[PDB]
Amino acid sequence: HKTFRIKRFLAKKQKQNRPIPQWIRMKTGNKIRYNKRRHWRRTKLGL
Amino acid sequence: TKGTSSFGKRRNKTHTLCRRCGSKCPAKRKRKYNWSAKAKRRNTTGTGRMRHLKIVYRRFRHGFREGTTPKPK
Amino acid sequence: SMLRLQKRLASSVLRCGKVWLDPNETNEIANANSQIRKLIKDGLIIRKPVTVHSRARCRKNTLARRKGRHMGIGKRKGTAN
Amino acid sequence: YSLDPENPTKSCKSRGSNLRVHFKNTRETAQAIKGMHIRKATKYLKDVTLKKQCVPFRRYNGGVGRCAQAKQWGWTQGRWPKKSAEFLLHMLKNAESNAELKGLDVDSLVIEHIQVNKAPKMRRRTYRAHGRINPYMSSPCHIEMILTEKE
RNA sequence: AGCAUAUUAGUCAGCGGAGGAGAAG
RNA sequence: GGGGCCCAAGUCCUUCUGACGAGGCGCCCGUGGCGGUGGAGGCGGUAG
RNA sequence: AGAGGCGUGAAACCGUU
RNA sequence: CGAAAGACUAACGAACCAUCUAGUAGCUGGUUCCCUCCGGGGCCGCUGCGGUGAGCCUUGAAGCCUAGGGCGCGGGCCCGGGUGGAGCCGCCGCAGGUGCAGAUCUUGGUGGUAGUAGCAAAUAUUCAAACGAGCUUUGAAGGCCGAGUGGAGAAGGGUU
RNA sequence: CCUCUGGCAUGUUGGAACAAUGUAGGUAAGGGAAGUCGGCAAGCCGGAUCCGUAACUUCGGGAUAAGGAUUGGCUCUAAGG
RNA sequence: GAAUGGAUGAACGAGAUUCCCACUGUCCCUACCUACUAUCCAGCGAAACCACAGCCAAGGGAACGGGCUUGGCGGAAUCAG
RNA sequence: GUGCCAGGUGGGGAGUUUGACUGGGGCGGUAC
RNA sequence: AUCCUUCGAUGUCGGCUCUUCACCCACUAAUAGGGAACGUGAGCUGGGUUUAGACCGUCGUGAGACAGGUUAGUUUUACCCUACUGAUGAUGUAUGUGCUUGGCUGAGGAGCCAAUGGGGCGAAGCUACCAUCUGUG
RNA sequence: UCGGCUCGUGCGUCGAUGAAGAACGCAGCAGCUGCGAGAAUUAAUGUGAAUUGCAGGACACAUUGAUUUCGCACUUGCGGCCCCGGGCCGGGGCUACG
């Protein structure tokens, strides 16, 4: 039992839980080395 | 049994997401107070997109001109 | 190697818990990721019989108690009523 | 390296970093095998893995039990660190492969130098009464060895 | 050097209303 | 009142260096003596 | 690279000679 | 709010949050260089500014290391050597967020303890084979759960 | 308590040994609370069937008071639709 | 000391007290057995605490020292308690 | 009844105070 | 009596164990008196005493007080150093056998499960002033 | 040291034509940032041959020419009025208070 808004929030939170693309490490001024990753057990969503 | 045992009975949410401020602010006016300047600066004009005020600044720098175009080639 | 998927599918298809995978056909199994029915038909995976729980002892004592045995003062735990 | 080889031509080296094996056990085992002929060291480490020969624990011997085999070393405390022995066996295999790569005589190699340094510690956590959290730290080690020809 | 008038102070917090200044005149 | 595009003069000789330094001509411009370029008045700039 | 995904690189502490 | 214990009010004889607030304290703790005199002097030291040194420096600045040579009663300083790679210092003045061993000081790092305490609630594992560099899987035994250690949902989680 | 359907691998490991002290269980001759602040804990009783049951009482109770006997296996008899 | 209630009186009470029966390792007086630890090993691996440390006698001393004084003396590294 | 003032009542509530010396402090005492 | 030490804590009565007192009963040969931080709580226990609940008496207008009585009331940590007890070492050429309950293996023969199913008898070993062993110039 | 702090100067411009703020979405291959279903930007003007982590723009040589959601209600719940198209479905415009 979910609402549409909760489900959309969950979908957005799911689409953000991926590693960075590797080619971004090759850019000219890149300071990132890895991804704000979230684990369902380690950290809980704001609900 | 007021500690660990009582923490297991946590099933019903007091709060949910707000439709105006998005936090988990029905009064027409916004909730803001002078005794928390940190809270005031966490949400103020400039912490968002300003998707209308920046254009206002750009148009002020030229006198709010409208109905004209740069001279055609 | 690991046959968890094959055993789970075999249990679901056979409607049992009781699944016997042939210990010698471990390579003809493990490439049946969907085919479990085909392996059932040729006997490579079988349904084992139910472990026996006979009622012969129960029937024999029930007959003995019909004749009237094990029903004395020393065998009663409840009141008459 | 520390203590560069005296005769660099007739010598080989082996190295390893951030080895997740206990520093203290490794240090004791390396001190036990130092100066040995490479065949003798290999046999000794296999015996350690088989509980046939001991490793004397001389400095980090707090609470270490006593064994009849430690008497071979003039010591009372000894153990059989399996992981340290297997790591050192790997490193010696690499060292003798390097020696073969340079045309050295492996059957006459002696462990001239060996050194175990502490590596950066690895963090985990353990949970303690009354809602506390304490560190559970791995103490890995760097290891280096230099084998030199002597006969 | 306690404390009640006093002081802190018409100040902090609270409410309402602006302008490019306001208010005043 | 805005916006845009421009406008002086060494990369000279020897030499150090991994590559605006040093020694000379002090040479050249100067109403022009901050930044970049592998310690610069002699690329953007600056003055007018 | 006695600069190796990191300028220099002290002390506490440890290994080895 | 309390069938009353000042009990409970998100781990209470007046909740929690922010502000007033750096609240006040005759009270506890700490309060940083040297020498001299009685019972002031620092060709001591740090950071920056005005002047000056036709000062120093990639033919190597600062910083750091050093069982090297020295100076000073000392605060300290000079030189040798190393490694380091880009700036720095003397003198005359000016200025200050200017010198630490303490404060159950703040932050960060690291020891001995120590390969130590320990990895002991819920009866229990064994044989063979397979993959593989090296408690998993399969088969066979022996066991356990027996208002379940079974099969399904609600709340919660959010892709597990 | 034991089993079948279903499920699991002994609950953050394993091996060797079987010292003390411990935690959790079991037994103990003769005595029987002498122990201890105190029979603490732990041990006696315990189910059914047939007998029997005091003081006192608000006549409801007390009451499973207290106390005694019996209980297996097997083969029958009688009764109960 | 009399609804700041006085007195009593069955049933009831994880309420306080005394005695008796029965029972028993509570005790005389301890012993043995089982399981899990502890123990040793492989793997893994904390914390509390810490001026410096860590053998005594007496003396004096902030009137009970570990160090000071005078004596006694003192022998690596450890393990289980 | 309401508005304003006046008198009473008002630990229901508010704020505050409840000396010093002293063979510890309190009681006593006054050597205040 | 004093207030020198300790109030950023030296655990506090008694008993028990090991190297209050009083009164009475009995035995004994005698049932002497004391100290060791009123020896001894990381040795125990927690009856007393010194929190918070509650009752009574007295006192107080009251909130409350009472070396006045009553009842119920969490006793933490050693793995460090030393001391001590022991231990290495250093220097110096019968699950046995019957019986038995419930269940299970189709029955029997045979067995198993019930964290040792219960019970009888019981080898070895261990062990008791619960020894018909020894104890000195 | 592409950041702060402090001082000074000029200006001093939000919103029902719907703001500040929030949500969601948008790139050939998460965040920040930039944008709004025309979504990593369209047009115009100036500038002038790049963008770049990776191949992928015929860049007319007049190098035109590279560089949404936040009438009644808040569950996408339920309407009403007028038009348009397709045969009830879809589209557009309206419908807050003072």
What do you get for the CA distance between the two ends of chain B, in Å? Answer: 83
- As a whole number of angstroms, the distance between CA B60 and CA B53 comes to 10
Give me the helix-helix angle, D38-49 and D82-101, nearest 10°.
Answer: 150
Of A9, A46, A14, A40, residue with least CA distance to B13: A46
Give me the resolution in angstroms, 1 decimal: 2.7
At residue D52, φ and ψ (nearest 5 deg) are -100, -30
Which positions on chain H have an atom < 7 Å from some protein CB? Answer: 8-11, 18-19, 110-111, 113-117, 128-131, 136-140, 154-160
- As a whole number of angstroms, the distance between CA D49 and CA D85 comes to 7
Write out chain B residues lying below 8 Å of A13, CB-based.
none
Of D40, D20, D13, residue with least CA distance to D112: D13
- Are A9 and B13 a contacting pair at CB < 8 A? no
Angstrom CA distances, A4 to A1, A12, A40, B18, stand at 10, 12, 20, 15
The residues pairing with C20 across neighbouring beta strands, listed in sequence order, are C46
Angle at A21 between CA A17 and CA A23, to 5 degrees: 170
The residues pairing with D117 across neighbouring beta strands, listed in sequence order, are D142
Token pair listed for A31: 């300071």
- As a whole number of angstroms, the distance between CA D11 and CA C81 comes to 99
User: Under the phi-then-psi rule, with left for phi > 0, alpha for psi from -120 to 50, and beta for the rest, what region is D30?
Assistant: alpha
Give me the helix-helix angle, D82-101 and D23-33, nearest 10°.
Answer: 50
CA at C54, C1' at K5: how many angstroms apart?
A: 105
- Are B24 and A9 a contacting pair at CB < 8 A? no
Torsion angle, CA of B1/B2/B3/B5, rounded to 10 degrees? 50
Token pair listed for D63: 């609470």
D58 close to D31: Cβ distance less than 8 angstroms:
yes
Write out chain B residues lying below 8 Å of A5, CB-based.
17
Please enumerate residues of A whose Cβ is less than 8 A from a Cβ of B. Answer: 5, 9, 46-47
Q: In what order do the strands lie in the sheet with D141-149?
A: D11-19, D141-149, D109-118
Token pair listed for A32: 């990132």
Token pair listed for D90: 């790997």
Angle at D87 between CA D83 and CA D90, to 5 degrees: 140
* DSSP H helices in chain C: 4-14, 36-41, 56-67
Q: Which chains touch C (3 or more CB pairs under 8 A)?
A: none
Which positions on chain I have an atom < 7 Å from some protein CB? Answer: 3-7, 47-50, 70-78
Please name the amino acid found at residue B18: C
- As a whole number of angstroms, the distance between CA C18 and CA C46 comes to 8
Cβ B29 to strand E below 7 Å = yes
Contact exists between A and B (3 or more beta carbon pairs < 8 Å): yes
The β-bridge relationship of strands D109-118 and D132-138 is: unpaired
User: Which residue shows structure tokens 């390396």?
Assistant: D30
Of D16, D3, D4, residue with least CA distance to D117: D16
Q: Tell me, what DSSP letter sits at residue D77?
A: B
Angstrom CA distances, D46 to B3, B66, D31, D42, D143, stand at 54, 90, 16, 6, 19
Which of B11, B14, B16, B19 has the highest number of chain A CBs within 10 A, making it the mutation to test binding with A? Answer: B16
Residues followed by a break in chain D (C to N exceeding 2.5 Å) are: none
Angstrom CA distances, A44 to A47, B46, C73, stand at 8, 29, 65
- Positions 5-44 in A, CB within 7 angstroms of strand G: 25
At residue D55, φ and ψ (nearest 5 deg) are -110, 120
| Sequence-ordered strand ranges (E) for chain D | 11-19, 55-56, 78-79, 109-118, 122-128, 132-138, 141-149
DSSP string across A1-47: ---HHHHHHHHHHHHT-SPPPGGGGGSTT----------TTTS----
Please name the amino acid found at residue D21: V
The β-bridge relationship of strands C19-21 and C45-47 is: antiparallel
Q: What would the 3-class secondary structure string for B15-71 be?
A: CCCCCCCCCCCCCCCCCCCCCCHHHHHHCCCCCCCCCCHHHHHHHHCCCCCCCCCCC
Residues followed by a break in chain B (C to N exceeding 2.5 Å) are: 24, 25
Q: Tell me, what DSSP letter sits at residue D18?
A: E
Q: Under 8 Å CB-to-CB from C44, ≥6 apart: which residues?
A: C21, C22, C25, C28, C29
Token pair listed for B26: 């029905």
Count of beta carbons in the 10 Å neighbourhood of residue C39: 21
Coil, helix or strand for B20?
Answer: coil
Coil, helix or strand for D127?
Answer: strand
